[PDB]
């Protein structure tokens, strides 16, 4: 378990450094389905989070030993997954809000009008589902890593290497959740099932991106185009 403890700490640190927790942030607040002012802020903040997700990925042990082609394949396939999980860990239930990394705090109607559109209730439902899991940074980070380092994405050159980079992450999460939450013994398969729930939402989100492109005034920001 010293190699496991090192892995958990590395991943916890990588998530923490690239994603402040809800309690650390100073919140601030601000006819047609897409409010272009909210869309502008939302797409800018998402761009910055994609950059932070890349910085998180590079700190995951082994990730940079994959070929560049596969690093890019993995990041593109997990982009919406990780963005959606991240914003869903910034949910305040008593105000029904989500808080972005600059502190911008939007309620459900505003999230709807920023771009989630018909996917708003689905995404807010998923955030509500995460709350009873009481995930800490190590757990959110490991779930993010497990979701990113997935050997079944299309067009991977070395999928077996990706699976073998993922298996230490799964074992770390299994061990960690046992030593943290012995009264919560089905918690590991419960959190892995959220990844599967998350893939379903992100598949619908990829559909929504096509409609958004037809609706926004100009172009998607360049990095978002690359990722999506």
């Amino acid at each position: 378990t010293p190699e496991v403890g090192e892995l958990i700490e590395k991943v916890r640190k990588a998530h923490q450094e690239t994603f402040p927790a809800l309690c650390q942030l100073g919140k601030y607040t601000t006819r047609v389905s897409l409010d272009i002012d909210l869309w502008d802020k939302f797409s800018e903040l998402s761009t910055k989070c994609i950059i932070k997700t890349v910085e998180f990925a590079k700190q995951l042990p082994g990730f940079t030993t994959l070929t560049i082609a596969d690093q890019i394949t993995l990041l593109k396939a997990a982009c919406l997954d990780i963005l959606i999980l991240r914003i869903c860990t910034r949910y305040t239930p008593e105000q029904d809000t989500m808080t972005f990394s600059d502190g911008l705090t939007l309620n459900r109607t505003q999230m709807h009008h920023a771009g989630f559109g018909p996917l708003t209730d689905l995404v807010f439902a998923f955030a509500n589902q995460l709350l009873p899991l009481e995930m800490d940074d190590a757990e959110t980070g490991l779930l993010s890593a497990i979701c990113l380092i997935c050997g079944d994405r299309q067009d991977l050159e070395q999928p077996d290497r990706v699976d073998m980079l993922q298996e230490p992450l799964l074992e770390a999460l299994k061990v960690y959740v046992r030593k943290r939450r012995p009264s919560r013994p089905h918690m590991f398969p419960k959190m892995l099932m959220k990844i599967t729930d998350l893939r379903s939402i992100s598949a619908k989100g990829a559909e929504r991106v096509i409609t958004l492109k037809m609706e926004i005034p100009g172009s998607m920001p360049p990095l978002i185009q690359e990722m999506l």
Binding site: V54, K58, T64, I68, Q71, I72, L223, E226, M227
Partner: peptide, 9 residues
């Protein structure tokens, strides 16, 4: 994927 290469290297 120009920006993404830069970010990774």
């Amino acid at each position: 994927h120009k920006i993404l290469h830069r970010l990774l290297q």
